[PDB]
């Protein structure tokens with residue numbers, strides 16, 4: 001894939017124009033076909049501009065220089081460096097989970113609770129404002145018991161905004177380092193549901209607003225991301241179901257469309273299947 005052609009120009013000191021055109025065509029084709037990405041035109045142009053600017057042929061290792069340009073533009077396209085959760089402000093840190101139904105929001109709250117307790121030694125509250133989907137509040141409660149985080153009780157009778165305000169009060173009164181807020185989603189982008197997410201965000205003033213999206217959705221993930229970024233000040237993105245996306249380019253798309261970093265990757269169904277996103281790692285893998 002992107003590996004194979006990039007290997008063929010790993011150590012070729014000639015870099016003839018046909019060799020550049022052939023390498024660029026397959027990277028264009030693999031980005032376009034291997035995944036649902038349509039902004040490849042911008043990536044190829046930047047790689048072409050840098051190659052002319054840095055005079056790759058002048059270098060002792062022109063193919064290595066050309067691949068270095070491709071990797072560096074890939075790392076930049078994916079966010080340059082890992083950005084962590086916004087936990088250096090004043091406790092409690094409020095993290096709002098936003099996204100469509102089926103993206104993986106409830107599972108990700110459990111994943112983040114495990115990650116925050118085991119790695120950052122933090123006290124964590126989880127609350128669910130999903131009074132619309134059936135059994136969802138119990139689903140968070142069960143996940144909280146599995147990951148060792150505390151749960152704030154919620155009921156279908158309550159209205160989402162009231163639930164979040166009450167949990168924030170517990171988080172401040174009991175000195176919780178982190179409050180994780182799970183929210184209801186719809187399966188397509190819905191304005192009414194987008195209006196209620198706005199009121200919940202306004203009430204709790206979240207330090208972190210995380211957009212959870214399914215990589216398997218492909219191009220639709222970027223469109224969903226733009227709509228959420230437009231109506232919410234997204235601080236980060238969580239890409240789920242990576243373990244089941246053979247294509248693998250929802251990542252590059254989202255950072256381009258939103259300008260917001262991917263902070264975490266969901267790589268499975270279990271609570272430990274969370275991995276922090278490192279653009280320089282992932283870029284080297286492919």
Ligand SMILES: Nc1nc2c(ncn2[C@@H]2O[C@H](COP(=O)(O)OP(=O)(O)OP(=O)(O)O)[C@@H](OP(=O)(O)OP(=O)(O)O)[C@H]2O)c(=O)[nH]1
Nearest residue numbers: 100101102103104105106107130240241244266267268269
């Ligand atoms: N392969 C994979 N699937 C994921 C991942 N994250 C979430 N899922 C799927 O999402 C389901 C649970 O998360 P959801 O409750 O649906 O997420 P949301 O609906 O957006 O939040 P919400 O409940 O509305 O608050 C899981 O079902 P199950 O846990 O029953 O397992 P299985 O994969 O076999 O089905 C998974 O199907 C991931 O990282 N990798």
